[model samples]
Target: ALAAPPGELTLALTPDDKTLDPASLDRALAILAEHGILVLTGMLRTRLTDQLRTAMLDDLPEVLRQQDVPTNFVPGHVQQDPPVRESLLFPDVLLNPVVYQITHAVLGADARNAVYSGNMNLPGSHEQPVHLDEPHLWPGISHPPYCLCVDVPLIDFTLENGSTEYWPGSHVLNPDECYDERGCVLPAELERRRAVAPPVRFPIPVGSVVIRDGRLWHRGVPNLSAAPRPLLAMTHYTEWFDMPPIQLPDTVKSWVDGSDRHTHAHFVAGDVDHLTGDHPFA
Candidate 1:
């Protein structure tokens, strides 16, 4: 059954906690095709989130101090990467089967993993202007989505802590009409969209993963809670996307090496400072 109204686009996986059934998987794919976003709950082990939550909390301080300005995308919102420790490099988050299933369907069988980083929303974070992570692969034209951002929240995403606000069905809008020269939505166009379909935000469970088209319209909101909220993000791309490789420690190299999805990364023998490494928009 659907988790909320049809427009909300949330799906609760079966209680058996087994691999998704064929029919349910088809439903998931359909939602992504139509809505540009889908949330699959009961898809992860809570124990894994517990470990990740602990590790992110421990690593966040250094990430915040890495730069004098800090990579704050918005006030109190920092771009943070989980520590590149072997213990935190697990298949559940890195190469989840459900994630690969959907990504392969959209990006082809040889889809590449382009990024493994995250964002931290500290208490008192402010709302951000709705924006696209990247403009369409081509301007003045459209094509099937070429990239998808798979986000896993270590802590339950509550309204109080700033779950992302999304504009549903915005990904398929014509890029020529929605974006201006700066790649931001034109001010007047945003007001026009508001009258037609307003943005939305909701609570998401800890183990759920939100798969969204990279072109979807979204923004961060205030983190009213006292504690920080950390979200692990990975970007999967079509085989043709030209992306740079990421740095990885040799110890966890096997994890990606054996996966169906190829992570573009160089496995170095020395320590990889994931905390301060340059990310996509860093």
Candidate 2:
């Protein structure tokens, strides 16, 4: 029942649409299997409390200053620190059970933690090239499965502010279809890929979510709006996968582990079993 920040936009599922009936869930799963992408608009309706938002904003400036790079940098761009600071994963007051269920149902219950949280502060004029998320992180595979991406915007993802562009069924592309020095598909392949899956602009209001397979061809467009664009993203995967542990300051680490909020958090590969105790931050 929380409200979006002033002027914020999002996409979410309606109350009636919140829980996909068994048949509907099955249909969605089938679509994912066939195309490897699913966009669930208005699927997440939870809102961040004002106090939490304030705290996140307060901590953001410092992180931005430290990272000094764009949240998602494209090839050929200077690698600088991040402008927006992402907080460690914590719980959320408005948990989206349907989103969770859908993800579990499609990706399997063994889905592992990929990224805890994502924050983007677009100061305008920033544009990301179209690309697939799996290529950069999980390359050298043909039809790699197990990786899923979920995006929940805290503001309206308008075309002017660099909305996300995706090809509807590009996930079905063959691995060799595109191969370049950067490991991306060749230019011809790119053109063919684009032809098959024309880019679609997705705009959702605050409190909405988009779920897609990591292999889908997509990109975050540039922000031409006068105002800054802020968003939150959480990426999850099957538990069988391994993620590097994030080393955090004792204070921050304690706060993250102890908090009961519903924000997605990352899981280190061996932390749950071997208890390696080695933090990635360290």
Candidate 3:
């Protein structure tokens, strides 16, 4: 059931959205259903952004070569457990009340962030291929949304710094509206559609997040700044969804909550593997 919620949503809506209340959540969900993206402008803390950006900078010592790992064309890295960079930890990122509240409303009254990943968009990078974080679960079938991407911009998201570009209402396109099975659109196609349905790219201020629809047509735009943009990324799904999460350590698990979910995703305290990298660093 796509939340045919009704309300105005924009930067102006931020101040009113500070609380974890029902009306705000309802309006936010409305924007999500209609726009394919909704920016929650002020819930993030400045220190959190500073902490995350520095963590990305610190990783640059080893983050030099993966000019295209996470996006496969953009210059960046796919770092896990990045909270370690600042002596911070995991469950905290997972426990944001504002985000958790929206996830619960969109996925279910019981949604949990089932996956976590960190990313950094570096300076002077080329625009990467357009792709979805994941495709819609239904094509010919009709369904609202099973999941959403909680995008926390760790710094200001100006286009010069490579804020993401997303197409609106693309999530509900009928199967015939697009041809790619994986749903990755071509350059010609992207522009053609852009002229029609068009796209939206707001200057995301620091300490903000955009709860994005998973199947929206979007891609990484170029970073024209003199520095890199590192942001923590997490995915929330109905408690019953898949892509079994990692087996977090007991110490880590102490902060991890499973009851928030109607049913939990998979995890068994598995051993760490392929934790770091070093290549083309000559």
Candidate 4:
């Protein structure tokens, strides 16, 4: 069971769960644009979450649990999740119309998914530093965020398991004022932002999505629970943004090659090896 809800509340655009309608869609997009995040409740199915969760843990290395590290230190994070071609990544989870529509609108029709990896917060892991997935392309820039992410959790994202914490509406803040020499949100800046717009510690409820602007200030909180918390992480890059190359097994190459669904990743038939094992995230 989860704890009492947080004082701050994030909500959906519609009460009936219908988000595809024109008027509803417009509001949803506006919410994301202004707030820099949105919690999509009941946006995923349990069957899909269970399967991906199982495969990810099964494929992960036992060595990962041995280290004492911050939750944000996700070296070898790419090794935890199954390749789109190999596991039970469902259509609703991967190709959710809302996610793509959001991605395409912000990233343009040619946006691609170059990163297919994930991170897991194991028991004993402490909270990670607050940071952005990537900084805004230019300093103090706002509007039409530089990037967006489809955050997926394979299990419940309760406070006990370290649900992500974020500074709502921070994406539009001056990038120069936010990041340090290495692009991390300096402690001083984080404190200031927290005072004005207190960071929300709400759960990312299971089978739900918390789509976010990559420029937003957020952190992976500590895991004080009994088991490991796994998540499937993927990114939809702005088209022609010069991202790392991505390849898929021939099995699903043809299937995703033509559609914008997996458009961010390049499908391949020849030798393809997805990352597996411990790696660094510096």
Q: In lDDT terms, which candidate is top?
A: 1
Candidate 4 residue lDDT tens string, 25-94: 6766787787788766677767778888887777556435546432355532223545554555455665
Give a tens-digit lDDT track for model 2, residues 160-247: 6656766666776655446444434466867876666555675556555667787777666667776555555556666665665433
Report, for every candidate in turn, its global Cα lDDT versus the true structure.
Answer: 0.80, 0.52, 0.63, 0.67
Please give the clash total of every predicted structure, in order: 0, 44, 1, 2
Q: Compute the lDDT of residue 272 as modeled in candidate 4.
A: 48
Model 4 misplaced stretches (Cα beyond 4 Å): 1-19, 62-71, 74-79, 175-177, 270-273, 277-282
> Which wins on TM-score, candidate 1 or candidate 3?
1
lDDT pick, better of 1 and 2? 1
The best-first sequence of candidates by lDDT reads 1, 4, 3, 2
Best model per TM-score = 1
Query: Any runs in candidate 3 off by more than 4 Å, and if so which?
Result: 1-19, 65-71, 74-81, 84-86, 90-92, 177-182, 186-192, 259-282
Report the error of model 3 at residue 8, Å.
5.4
Which scores higher on TM-score, 2 or 4?
4
Better of 1 and 4 by TM-score: 1
Worst 10 residues of 2 by lDDT: 76-85
Error of 3 at 260 (Å): 2.0
For residue 1, model 1's alpha carbon misses the true position, in angstroms, by 21
